[PDB]
Amino acid sequence: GPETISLHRQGLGFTIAGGQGSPHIAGDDGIFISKIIPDSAAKEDGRLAVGDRVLSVQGESCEKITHERAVEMLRNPASPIVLVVEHNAFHKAT
């Protein structure tokens, strides 16, 4: 199910793939975590995983949005940034 992950800024430590107009999976425009950066907030926290589907950032939905919109949400200067994700979402989808 959806899991809430709050990351505190000291970048958050991950990259994303996907979005409307640049899907990462055929037929699925979702925003997915594509890499956990070593020695980062996301890595130290340990919850976020490659393949997670990002459902929200700061409570705002990441379903059916463009990659650019997702990047904008993730560069909000606020801290912490509150993510809601689905784990194993890529593997579940494929």
Side-chain angles (χ1 to χ4, degrees):
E3 295 184 43
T4 296
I5 299 169
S6 297
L7 295 180
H8 293 270
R9 298 190 179 282
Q10 277 227 268
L12 300 177
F14 64 90
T15 59
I16 54 165
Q20 172 194 320
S22 60
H24 182 64
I25 299 171
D28 188 332
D29 285 343
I31 302 297
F32 296 92
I33 305 299
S34 55
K35 173 172 178 50
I36 302 297
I37 304 295
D39 194 27
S40 70
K43 184 57 172 284
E44 295 173 16
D45 176 275
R47 284 174 291 179
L48 197 68
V50 172
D52 287 354
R53 179 188 305 275
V54 181
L55 296 173
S56 65
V57 178
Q58 295 306 68
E60 186 175 3
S61 183
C62 297
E63 288 186 57
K64 302 185 182 176
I65 65 168
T66 63
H67 196 273
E68 192 180 30
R69 178 78 189 108
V71 176
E72 293 171 13
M73 295 183 194
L74 290 168
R75 302 202 66 196
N76 183 338
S79 182
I81 296 293
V82 183
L83 307 174
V84 178
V85 307
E86 301 185 339
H87 281 315
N88 224 15
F90 179 90
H91 288 155
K92 285 172 215 160
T94 57

